[PDB]
């Protein structure tokens, strides 16, 4: 259980070692304006994604950060968001926990 793959296709995405304690915890439970709930895990780093469009501040769940949608690079599944434009760290990834599968390296 040290690495994370896309649950839908197996693409390698991130690692447990890359989890990022944001505001005290790597886990945040948040809602979008369409009322969908997400269990978001924060990572310092991820790979195998494809970032779509340019960043937006609108409805950002993390103060001072702008988001871009992050799809699985391989299958297109929506895995989370890349955050940028902030401070300490400047950037990070918020990934949806139930869209990842955890397993050996
Ligand atoms: C599942 O969709 C989405 C769900 C959630 C957000 C978040 C709101 N606050 C954040 O920190 C990002 C953006 C989305 O993408 C939208 C942009 C255009 C259509 C959908
Ligand atoms: Zn995938």
Question: Best substitution site from 60, 69, 86, 92 to test ligand 1's pocket, by max atoms within 8 Å of Cβ?
Answer: 69
Token duo for residue 26: 């790597």
Q: Beta partners for 29?
A: 39
Q: Is 72 marked as binding a ligand?
A: yes
Residues 6+ apart with CB under 8 A from 102: 1, 2, 3, 4, 5, 16
Instruction: Kindly state the DSSP code that residue 57 receives in the 8-state scheme.
Output: -
Give how far the C-alpha of residue 57 lies from the chain's centroid of Cα atoms, to the nearest Å.
16
Atom 20, ligand 1: which residue's CA is nearest? Answer: 69
Residue among 71, 67, 98, 62 at smallest CA distance from 82: 67
Q: Compute φ and ψ for 97, nearest 5 degrees.
A: -55, -45
Indicate the pairing of strand 100-103 with strand 49-56. unpaired
Token duo for residue 58: 């609108």
Token duo for residue 5: 């793959």
Q: Where are the domains of the chain?
A: 1-105
CA distance 91 to 53: 16
């Amino acid at each position: 259980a040290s690495i994370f793959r896309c649950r839908q296709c197996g693409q390698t995405i991130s690692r447990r070692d890359w989890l990022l304690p944001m505001g005290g915890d790597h886990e945040h439970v948040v809602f979008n304006p369409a009322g969908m709930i997400f269990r978001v895990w924060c990572f310092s780093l991820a790979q195998g994604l494809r970032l779509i469009g340019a960043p937006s501040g609108e409805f950002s769940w993390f103060k001072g950060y702008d988001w871009t949608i992050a799809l699985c690079g391989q299958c297109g599944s929506h895995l989370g968001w890349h955050y940028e434009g902030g401070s300490q760290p400047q950037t990070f990834f918020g990934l949806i926990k139930d869209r990842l599968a955890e397993g050996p390296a």
